Symmetry: C2
């Protein structure tokens, strides 16, 4: 499988998941219908998205790591799938929620070859491959901000901060893309609990890095070794190269 | 002027502003074209929105209080207008920005009779009159959340906080409506700077109050006396009755 397949498989998945969600009323979306393999609840929205996405993905030679059903298949290509990131917003009719896919040639993130995050409320398409990083078919790159007085996405602010603004939209895979296109000067998830799972971050990190961004765990270590399994957890620090060391210091 | 008019006029404005903003590309939206009377810079997006809003509004017996052009007209009816709330999001293409109006029979908030907030990205229409509060034509009400372990919108977290979820979207007039329909259990703007202006909050407060929520200033006092002028500033604490006093306690 190559980056071209992945882009085609992702489009197909994005379409069906956009249908399935659009067709499901809010009151239905919010029902708890099961336990996820990740150990969080599966809402009726998640299940309906994952089923649509899995229908298409299992037909490929892959192993899938997905929030609700867990680890499936035995292929050499691994796919980190958040069938629905921002499930809370989707249950409330808040227009920031996405399906997110990262394809890797290995169970480690450093062998990623494709990232895909698709906003299910607006149809904004972010993805990345060899050619670079794209939003709705147009190349996206990060910002050049040098000052700490920047626009920040941060989970969670818990002290005074020198930021011009802080924002928290409740869809990590999409907010990583808000950073990748330069909308925001950085993405911080410094929650000491280390909450983010591989299917939350992977696509977003890949897109951000291809868009030029410096992306590392809470203390600057490559994310290359993060595994495509359900056990994996992440803190993320992400900014342009000039600003990144500055943030690393700040959150010490 | 009655609440029926205000609806008709607000909807007529929403349309024009949806169009004008829609046909203006991001790269154009973000240009600084002037200094607003409010003392913040006017982006090209603000200008086109406001110009379209005022075109319609000044045909009415009103005094308008607006972010970019300040105070206009001499009507006994005062309208607090944010021609574009969430200007930052709009310049980036994040589907959370609104036009916002609050009509009042006098220059104090207590004499409000119509509230209106329209998301210019999704077309979600919030409003309220005597008959109650509506989102897309269907009635809404605040949540019944009792515990501090609730979903919160907060400007700005700088502490430990017992919330289940914190979010910050960048459109106060829209976020007060996310509160009003029970998407979030409370809306907190506790910034010591007292950053909120009458046209940011007034529509949102009215809608939230009609939807059942208790909305007060930082210390519990009524917002009744807030003036329709450029000078005026606000902190907000909004929640259902059971939760509200718990939150007042929580912050100090
Ligand atoms: Mg779950
Ligand atoms: Mg979930
Ligand atoms: Mg201004
Ligand atoms: Mg402005």
């Amino acid at each position: 499988m190559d980056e071209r397949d992945a882009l085609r498989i992702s489009r197909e998945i994005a379409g069906e998941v956009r249908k399935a969600i659009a067709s499901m009323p809010l009151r239905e979306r919010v029902k708890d219908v099961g336990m996820g393999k990740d150990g969080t609840p599966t809402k009726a929205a998640d299940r309906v998205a994952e089923d649509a996405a899995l229908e298409i993905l299992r037909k490929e030679r892959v192993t899938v790591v997905t929030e609700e059903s867990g680890v499936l298949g035995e292929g050499d290509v691994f796919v980190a799938l958040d069938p629905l990131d921002g499930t809370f917003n989707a249950t409330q009719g808040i227009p920031v929620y996405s399906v997110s896919l990262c394809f890797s040639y290995s169970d480690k993130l450093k062998d990623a070859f494709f990232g895909y995050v698709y906003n299910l409320a607006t149809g904004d398409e972010y993805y990345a491959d060899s050619s670079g990083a794209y939003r709705n078919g147009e190349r996206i790159e990060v910002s050049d901000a040098e000052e700490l007085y920047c626009n920040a996405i941060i989970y969670y602010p818990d002290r005074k901060f020198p930021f011009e603004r802080m924002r928290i939209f409740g869809s990590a895979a999409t907010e990583l893309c808000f950073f990748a296109d330069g909308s925001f000067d950085c993405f911080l998830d410094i929650r000491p609990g280390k909450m983010l799972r591989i299917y939350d971050a992977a696509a977003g990190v890949f897109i951000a890095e291809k868009a030029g961004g410096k992306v590392t765990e809470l203390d600057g270590e490559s994310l290359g070794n993060k595994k495509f399994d359900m056990q994996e957890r992440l803190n993320i620090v992400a900014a342009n190269e000039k600003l990144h060391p500055k943030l690393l210091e700040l959150i010490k």
